[PDB]
Structure 1
């Protein structure tokens, strides 16, 4: 589990979004595994605006942050998981690392701020849903 709290937005994995998230929906994309809802309180996170390919991500199933190199966001085939069938996911970045389903929502960050959140795992990779292209998260 986990979210990004930027401005008055809460960015979650679409598959973990709550009823309250859907009732306060700003934007959602199943192909990206993302959903954004509106918040009453302002949040503490800053979104990275950059093309970094190195950062640090939080792994809840290890209680550890790991430094990783990761691919640029692309359209990637993802094998079946506990929460999705086997399918193509867009705007997905991969790194070599540990990820189980409950790790979804852990933050990947670089020197510029939050890059994305854990969205995929298995076979010794961790996949992250990018948010750096969502420039509208920084205003309004």
Structure 2
């Protein structure tokens, strides 16, 4: 579990969005596993605007933050998980590291701020849904 809070937006894994998220929907994209809902309070997080490929992510199934190198966001085949069938996920970054389903929502951060959230795992990789392209998270 976990979310990003920026401005009056909450960014969550689409597959973990609640009824309240859907009832306050701003934007969602199944291909990316992302959903954004509106908040009443202002968020604590800063979104990175960069092409960093090094950062640190939170792994809840280890109670640990790990430094990782990760690939640039791309269209990647993901094997079946507890929450999605095998499919192509867009805007996905991969790193070598531990990730189980419940690790979804852990933040990946670089020197500039939040890069994305854990979205995939298995076979010794962790996948992150990028958010650095979503410039609108900082306005309106």
- Indicate the TM-score class for this superposition, using the shorter chain for normalisation: over 0.9
Which ranges in structure 1 are unaligned for 5 or more consecutive residues? Answer: none
1:52-109: per-residue Cα shift (whole Å, max 9, x none)?
Answer: 0000000000000000000000000000000000000000000000000000000000
How big is the alpha-carbon RMSD for the aligned residues of Structure 1 and Structure 2? 0.2
The list of structure 1 runs, each at least 4 consecutive aligned residues, that deviate by more than 2 angstroms after superposition, is none
Calculate the TM-score normalised by the size of structure 1: 1.00
3-state DSSP class of the match of 1:61?
helix
1: CA distance, partners of 2:53 / 2:21 = 30
3-state DSSP class of the match of 2:48?
coil
The size of the alignment, in residue pairs, is 140
Calculate the TM-score normalised by the size of structure 2: 1.00
1:2-59: per-residue Cα shift (whole Å, max 9, x none)?
Answer: 0000010000000000000000000000000000000000010000000000000000
3-state DSSP class of the match of 1:105?
coil
